[PDB]
């Protein structure tokens, strides 16, 4: 059971930005305490998996929107905004995209993979626009996800191998043409460390925006750790925001490196307090902060961990009280 009378987390930030959470379609029923936490503390939702490529078009032409629509319906019923995650990725993407269908031992051509990307993006955006119309809660999409490698070069996924570097520009062109009302983001991790990957994200977005690509924002996943440096995160946010794009914190959690002791929980609370004070200090750039999971027992990180504001018993942690 949850604590029903403590402060609603998102209301603490009502004069700053929405506070969201990533959810599983099976944890939205009234009797599920995870759903109760979701409705109480968040005013924005993201599908942790149900809107990834494999979760929407597992085989060619066979679209599977039921789980994504269950999350959308819940968001509408709870007056929540949503982010769409994600139109393109090199993981959780079916192999059929990249195969020649008449000889699956060979790769699809650049034109066939671009047409498949255009059809997937257009069908996905047209599905939510035609089914929900003005009630569509999705305000924007992660058009591409994790397109940089660790060294800052473009990740050599099958998209890059088959199409070349302009696949990124093409994904944003297709999404903007399908629904011009959507805010379009490029999303990535490790771009908060003010290292070579931050610089490569800045250079890539500067280049594409100068070329007229409709990129409206950068999503900083923010899978941080108990040892992260606030100064590096601040410098990264400011550098990326200097491009004249929105910043969203999209998959926030804190990796404890195996130390879930009470002392580490206190250290986590001080760091999360500093992180949210930084986000408030950057409110002219940040337009959403989303946590990657509702509570520690449903975090994607392997065990042991304690990455979020609500523990494995769904109770508010020291970090929750530090922030509120």
The most distant pair of C-alpha atoms in the chain lies apart, rounded to whole Å, by 60
Q: Given the residues 146, 192, 246, 251, select the one marked as catalytic.
A: 251
Looking at the DSSP bridge assignments, the partners of residue 259 are none
Is 251 among the residues known to form the active site?
A: yes
Q: How far is the C-alpha of 267 from the C-alpha of 79, rounded, in Å?
A: 34
CATH superfamily of this structure's domain 1-324: Glycosidases (3.20.20.80)
**Contacts of residue 139, Cβ cutoff 8 Å, sequence gap at least 6:** 81, 82, 83, 182, 183
CB 9 within 8 A of CB 324: yes
**Given phi > 0 = left and psi -120 to 50 = alpha, else beta, which region is 245?**
beta
- Experimentally, the structure was elucidated by X-ray
Would you call 152 exposed, middle or buried from its count of C-beta atoms within 10 A (0-12, 13-18, 19+)? middle
Looking at the DSSP bridge assignments, the partners of residue 15 are none
Looking at the DSSP bridge assignments, the partners of residue 220 are 188, 249
**Ranges of H-type helices in the chain:** 9-12, 33-41, 53-56, 66-77, 110-132, 158-163, 167-178, 196-210, 230-241, 262-281, 318-323
Q: Where are the beta strands (DSSP E) in 108-182?
A: 138-145
CB 152 within 8 A of CB 204: no
Q: How far is the C-alpha of 17 from the C-alpha of 88, rounded, in Å?
A: 26
CB 50 within 8 A of CB 138: no
Long-range Cβ pairs for the range 1-8 (8 Å, 24+): 1/33, 1/314, 2/33, 2/36, 2/37, 2/40, 2/314, 2/315, 3/315, 3/316, 4/36, 4/40, 6/316, 6/320, 6/324, 7/324, 8/40, 8/41
Whether the ω angle into residue 86 lies within 30 degrees of 0, i.e. cis, is yes
Q: Is 62 helix (H, G, I), strand (E, B) or coil?
A: strand
**DSSP run (H or E) holding 68:** helix 66-77
Whether the ω angle into residue 68 lies within 30 degrees of 0, i.e. cis, is no
Q: How far is the C-alpha of 55 from the C-alpha of 281, rounded, in Å?
A: 37
Torsion of CA 84, 87, 93, 96, to 10 degrees: 140
CB 48 within 8 A of CB 293: yes
Q: How far is the C-alpha of 190 from the C-alpha of 195, rounded, in Å?
A: 8
The angle, 0 to 180 degrees and rounded to 10, between the axes of the packed helices 230-241 and 196-210 is: 10
CB 127 within 8 A of CB 172: no
Q: Is 104 helix (H, G, I), strand (E, B) or coil?
A: strand
Closest of 132, 6, 30 to residue 81, by C-alpha: 132
CB 293 within 8 A of CB 253: yes
Q: How far is the C-alpha of 175 from the C-alpha of 173, rounded, in Å?
A: 6
Torsion over CA: 224, 144, 297, 1 (sign): positive
Domain boundaries, the chain: 1-324
Long-range Cβ pairs for the range 99-107 (8 Å, 24+): 101/60, 107/158, 107/161, 107/162
Closest of 181, 76, 49, 175 to residue 132, by C-alpha: 76
- One-character DSSP codes across 189-220: SSTTS-SHHHHHHHHHHHHHHHTT----EEEE
């Amino acid at each position: 059971t949850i604590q029903n009378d403590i402060p609603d987390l998102y209301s603490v930030f009502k004069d700053y930005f929405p506070i969201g959470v990533a959810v599983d379609p099976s944890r939205l029923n009234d009797a599920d305490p995870h759903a109760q936490l979701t409705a109480k503390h968040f005013n924005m939702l993201v599908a942790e998996n149900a809107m990834k490529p494999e979760s929407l078009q597992p085989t060619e032409g066979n679209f599977t929107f039921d789980n994504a629509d269950k999350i959308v319906d819940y968001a509408i019923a709870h007056n929540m905004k949503m982010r769409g995650h994600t139109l393109l990725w090199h993981n959780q993407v079916p192999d059929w995209f990249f195969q020649d269908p008449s000889d699956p031992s060979k790769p699809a051509s650049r034109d066939l993979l671009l047409q498949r990307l255009r059809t997937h993006i257009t069908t996905v955006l047209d599905h939510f626009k035609t089914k929900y119309g003005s009630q569509n809660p999705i305000i924007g999409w992660d058009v591409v996800n994790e397109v940089l490698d660790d060294n800052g070069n473009l990740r050599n996924s099958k998209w890059l191998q088959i199409i070349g570097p302009d696949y990124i520009e093409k994904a944003f062109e297709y999404a903007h043409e399908a629904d011009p009302s959507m805010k379009l983001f490029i999303n990535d991790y490790n771009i908060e460390n003010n290292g070579v990957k931050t610089q490569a994200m800045y250079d890539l977005v500067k280049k594409l925006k100068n070329e007229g690509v409709p990129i409206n924002g950068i999503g900083m996943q923010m899978h941080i750790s108990i040892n992260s440096n606030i100064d590096n995160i601040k410098a990264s946010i400011e550098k990326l925001a200097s491009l004249g794009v929105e910043i969203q914190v999209t998959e926030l959690d804190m990796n404890m490196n195996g130390d879930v002791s009470n002392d580490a929980l206190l250290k986590q609370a001080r760091l999360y307090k500093q992180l949210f004070d930084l986000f408030k200090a950057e409110k002219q750039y940040i337009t959403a902060v989303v946590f990657w999971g509702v509570s520690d027992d449903v975090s994607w990180l392997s065990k042991p961990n304690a990455p979020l504001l609500f523990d494995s018993k769904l109770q508010a942690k020291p970090a929750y009280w530090a922030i509120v």
